[PDB]
């Protein structure tokens, strides 16, 4: 599922600015 | 009316914009409690004002780090804009000052924590819950854009939940007063409009795109464009393609297609009817825009309040002592701070 793919990704924590 | 409110709001803004508040406190007037958050230039700490007993959130920026990262102008923008604005959903800057080593912005403490935290934990917000928060962002952007300000950092990490369950917009580090178009590559990978990525000049419409990303993320529980690396996120943004979860209503999908719109001649917030294209959209039909402003609407979530200086709705951070140099650093660069 998209949720499972998101939860398993490295970008579920606080995201930094660029 | 809206036009009458906006006229008087512009007048109060420009007075403070032209003659900014400066050196309104001392470091020794506060007791440092805990770190509430971190960044590349420093941290945000829970402080206690010794004379009043009130708790505040104090953002501390190391000047040397600001200079090294080429963020002097962005830092001056942040403080000048924050001391000048006044809207119910923007965090209030109480004091500002500087010393030999750092810049300080003392703001009202919002103890309910970040929207980010409740969003990740809960998973996703229901459509009325996301609509409640989105409405507040719409009125906030309408206020800021009428002042020629672009926010450029909308994300759940920057939205704090207050004791009444309302949003307090935080971090004006990328906020800018610009009449025409601007070119700085800045923001958060997931929230960048295609025109920022494609190094085109851009305007206020990037904030409306960011609104589309925020509403999708609140309602789905994940952003519309995600990957492991920022480069992969940009490929997804610039290519049209947005997939919506099957639980999304037709109205939500329709509004998001008009916010996450590549074509600037079709993106909502930008067009002839302006902000009213959003306010009048069918997904917002139950929204009483005046009651949201007046904070008369019962919030779908009220966070737990243990005490005035309770930090339980925030994460724990590695504490580092504030070092104030005996010699003044970057004095010329931060002269107007
Ligand atoms: O600014 C920050 C994070 C933060 C804090 C300190 C230093 C930072 O360095 C800047 C790194 C680059 C940024 C430039 C602008 N876009 C994002 C990246 C960032 N936090 C803020 N918190 C508050 C705040 C007000 N009231 C509060 N109440 C509780 C918790 C926090 C707050 C205001 S600004």
Commentary on this structure:
Chain B: GO terms for molecular function: ATP binding; cAMP-dependent protein kinase activity; channel activator activity; magnesium ion binding; manganese ion binding; protein domain specific binding; protein kinase A regulatory subunit binding; protein kinase activity. Chain B: It is found in: Cytoplasm; Cell membrane; Membrane; Nucleus. The complex is a heterodimer of chains A (18) and B (337). With 18 residues, chain A is mainly alpha-helical. Chain A is built from one helix and no strands. Chain B folds into two domains: 209 residues, Transferase(Phosphotransferase) domain 1 (Transferase(Phosphotransferase), domain 1); 125 residues, Phosphorylase Kinase, domain 1. In chain B, the strands form three sheets. Chain B has a five-stranded antiparallel β-sheet. Chain B has a two-stranded antiparallel ribbon with strand order 6-9. Chain B has eleven helices and nine strands. In chain B, β1 and β2 form a beta hairpin. Chain B is globular and about 60 Å long. In chain B, 42% of the residues are buried. Chain B has 337 residues and is of the alpha+beta class. Chains A and B meet through α1 of A and loops of B. The structure holds ligand 504.
Which architecture of the largest domain in chain B per CATH? Answer: Orthogonal Bundle
- Rg of chain A, nearest Å: 9 Å
Which structural class is indicated by helix and strand composition of chain A? mainly alpha
Annotation, overall tally of beta strands of chain B: 9
């Amino acid at each position: 599922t998209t949720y499972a793919d998101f939860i398993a990704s490295g970008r579920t924590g606080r995201r930094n600015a660029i | 009316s809206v036009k009458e409110f906006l006229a008087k709001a512009k007048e109060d803004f420009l007075k403070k914009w032209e003659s900014p508040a400066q050196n309104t406190a001392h470091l020794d007037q506060f007791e440092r409690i805990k770190t509430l958050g971190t960044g590349s230039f420093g941290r945000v700490m829970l402080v206690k004002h010794k004379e009043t007993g009130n708790h505040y959130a104090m953002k501390i920026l190391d000047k040397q780090k600001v200079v090294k990262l080429k963020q002097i102008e962005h830092t001056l923008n942040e403080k000048r804009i924050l001391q000048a604005v006044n809207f119910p959903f923007l965090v209030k800057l109480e004091f500002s000052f500087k010393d030999n080593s750092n810049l300080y912005m003392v703001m009202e403490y919002v103890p309910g924590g970040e929207m980010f935290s409740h969003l990740r934990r809960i998973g996703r917000f229901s459509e009325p819950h996301a609509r409640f928060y989105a409405a507040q962002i719409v009125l906030t952007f309408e206020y800021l854009h009428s002042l020629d300000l672009i926010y450029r950092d909308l994300k759940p990490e920057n939205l704090l939940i207050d004791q009444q369950g309302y949003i307090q917009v935080t971090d004006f580090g990328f906020a800018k007063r610009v009449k025409g178009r601007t070119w700085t590559l800045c923001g958060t990978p997931e929230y960048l409009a295609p025109e920022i990525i494609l190094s085109k000049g851009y305007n206020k419409a990037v904030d409306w795109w960011a609104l589309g990303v925020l509403i999708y993320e609140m309602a789905a529980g994940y952003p519309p464009f995600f990957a492991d690396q920022p480069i992969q996120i940009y490929e997804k943004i610039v290519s049209g393609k947005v997939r919506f979860p099957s639980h999304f209503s037709s109205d939500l999908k329709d509004l998001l297609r008009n916010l996450l719109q590549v074509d600037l001649t079709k993106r909502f917030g930008n067009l002839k009817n302006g902000v009213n294209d959003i306010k009048n959209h069918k997904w917002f039909a139950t929204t009483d825009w005046i009651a949201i402003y007046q904070r008369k609407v019962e919030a779908p979530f009220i966070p737990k309040f243990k005490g005035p200086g309770d930090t339980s709705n925030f994460d724990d951070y590695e504490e580092e002592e504030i070092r104030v140099s005996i010699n003044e650093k970057c004095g010329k660069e931060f002269s107007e701070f």
